[PDB]
């Protein structure tokens, strides 16, 4: 006899939009999210296993779309730089990293146009004599971030809609692929802070016992391997100078901000990372990479490539954009602080979106940043047909795809739907 049951504890993999929740407008305007439950504890599913794949996981794709959308929602109404895209006459003030440039400005919300000056970085300048244009004062649109809007990562929790559940893999050293034998479930994920960086991942979760490395295909050199440390390596970064800001009227209701003055002398931005922790970190990574590649000597050979956003380590700090010289870190080899000059840019090709860019306002000097350094994004350098000559594997820093930064955390989660109805035979009326 067919007996009907309701409340059957079964589920299937399913895709659905996840609900945003918070711990409690900037970019991460989480006041629009629903605060999570107190004591949001999980349920351990004993004798339940599940099959995970971090490179298929759609939670990463949803997260990707939210971070882009939020960034555009907050930048949309802000002052345009575009009306200022004129050719300017500039002087040289390590040389002339920050330059005092000037033009007969045609905005200034007036008919009586005037000469005005501003301080810009050479990093954002295309020479055009001593005249120039900015790098995105070509075939792209530049908007400046509102001075009232911070980025503020904030940990964000994603929750299943009712009728759905998130299964979490708690199996130690799990690589994000295949069956997980330690599975528990939650309505909501833990809060994950957005991280905006390349090459090195910032504060986030750590590996349980030892550094672990994950890849969709380790032998495919077109893929990036994600290295998760079991300990962090703290780094401090600064901009050891003072500055002032100046406004330009662009529109009757909008002001554009540039550096007004350099206060005190000019000094290079830089980072200072513990050398001992860094050296131990690469030895640990190389050890695990050797297990993955059996037994080859492993070397770190600095970055390479074109665009500095990929080649230099990048990160956000407050509202500032830093690019750092990691050639001082990705060095040496194993077969068993450190100062990084940095650069500050004002025009950001965020998301590598073609045709658009953001301009960052001045912070008036005194930049103080810090981070944990929790993992690496690496690619292999090469190989080709060879006449049985030699060996040694080498790696380089990688980045530019924000989905890997998210993937490095989302690898522990899967979304399923709950299907409470079913039948089974018994006996009945």
């Amino acid at each position, epitope marked *: 006899w067919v007996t009907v049951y309701y409340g059957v504890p079964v589920w299937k993999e399913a895709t659905t939009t996840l609900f945003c929740a918070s711990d409690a407008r900037n970019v991460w305007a989480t006041h629009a999210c629903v605060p999570t439950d107190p004591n949001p504890q999980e349920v351990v599913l004993e004798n339940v296993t599940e099959n995970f794949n971090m*490179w298929k996981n759609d939670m990463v794709e949803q997260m990707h779309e939210d971070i882009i959308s939020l960034w555009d929602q907050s930048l949309k109404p802000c002052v345009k730089l575009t009306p200022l895209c004129v050719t300017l006459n500039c002087t040289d003030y390590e040389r002339g990293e920050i330059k005092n440039c000037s033009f007969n400005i045609t905005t200034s919300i007036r008919d009586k146009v005037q000469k005005e000056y501003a301080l810009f970085y050479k990093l954002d300048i295309v020479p055009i004599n001593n005249s120039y244009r900015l790098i995105n004062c070509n*075939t792209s649109v530049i908007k400046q971030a509102c001075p009232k809007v911070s980025f503020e990562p904030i940990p964000i929790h994603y929750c299943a809609p009712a009728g759905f559940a998130i299964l979490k893999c708690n199996d130690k050293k799990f690589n994000g692929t295949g069956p997980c034998t330690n599975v528990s479930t939650v309505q909501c994920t833990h809060g994950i802070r957005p991280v905006v960086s390349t090459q090195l991942l910032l504060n986030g979760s750590l590996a349980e016992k030892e550094v672990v490395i994950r890849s*969709q*295909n380790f*032998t*495919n*050199n*077109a*893929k990036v391997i994600i290295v998760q440390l079991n300990e962090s390596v703290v780094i401090n970064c600064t901009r050891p100078n003072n500055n002032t800001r100046k406004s330009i009227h662009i529109a009757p209701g909008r002001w554009f901000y540039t550096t007004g003055a350099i206060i005190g002398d000019i000094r290079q931005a830089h980072c200072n990372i513990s050398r001992v922790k860094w050296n131990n970190t690469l030895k640990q990574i190389a050890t695990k990479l050797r297990e993955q590649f059996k037994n080859k000597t492993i070397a770190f050979n600095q970055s*390479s*490539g*074109g*665009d500095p956003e*990929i080649v230099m380590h990048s990160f956000n700090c407050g509202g500032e954009f830093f690019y750092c010289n990691t050639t001082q870190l990705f060095n040496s080899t194993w077969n068993d602080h450190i100062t990084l000059p940095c650069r500050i840019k004002q025009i950001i090709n965020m998301w*590598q979106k*073609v045709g658009k860019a953001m301009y960052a306002p001045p912070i008036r000097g005194q930049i103080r940043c810090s981070s944990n350094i929790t993992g690496l994004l690496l*690619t*292999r*350098d*090469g*190989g*080709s*047909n*060879e*006449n*049985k000559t030699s*060996e040694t594997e080498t790696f380089r820093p*990688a*980045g*530019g*795809d924000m989905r890997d930064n998210w993937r490095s955390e989302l690898y522990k989660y899967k979304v399923v739907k709950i299907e409470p109805l079913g039948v089974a035979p018994t006996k009945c009326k």
Partner: antibody
Amino acid sequence: QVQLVQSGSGVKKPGASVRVSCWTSEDIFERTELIHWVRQAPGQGLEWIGWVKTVTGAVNFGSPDFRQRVSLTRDRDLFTAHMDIRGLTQGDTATYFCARQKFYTGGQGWYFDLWGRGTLIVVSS
Amino acid sequence: EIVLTQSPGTLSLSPGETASLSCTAASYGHMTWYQKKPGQPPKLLIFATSKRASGIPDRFSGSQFGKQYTLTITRMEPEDFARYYCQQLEFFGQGTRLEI
């Protein structure tokens, strides 16, 4: 068989540099994950040179000699890519080709779905 | 280490009969096949997953079940008497040629 457009053929003297371009249609370019470059010297099999990633400009090389002498770049506004070879020797005479890969997942391997016609680069006295 | 090798290299054929080519490689994995005529870039025949590439009128196919992959060439048609190559990611075979 969609063709890609390459810069032309020519002869260079030793030590010279050559600009090998590869242009494609806007949709062909956008649907490509990787741009691959290969070399086929007369009498030789096909040698992989390297690749440049279509979004980031990130690179990977076959031989370390290419890693030192060959710059692989991309331009998303122009829908082009380039292979800039410096330090040419007579041993580099070959037909050079650009090709593109539309494949994106693990387990698929590498592909040449789209091809240019190749350019003949000759290096001599 | 020679990661990928290809053979027979030189094949003596009789059109109407079916030919076979093979490649073996270190670390296994999927591998593709391409063929070219002089003056042209090679065309993809076999996807790394052994699937037939578009444009081929059901002439080429094969399988692995080891470090080796073997494909056959239907009826040795002279139209396909091209130089063939295997590819395993960054490695290529030295190639083979079909000759009557």
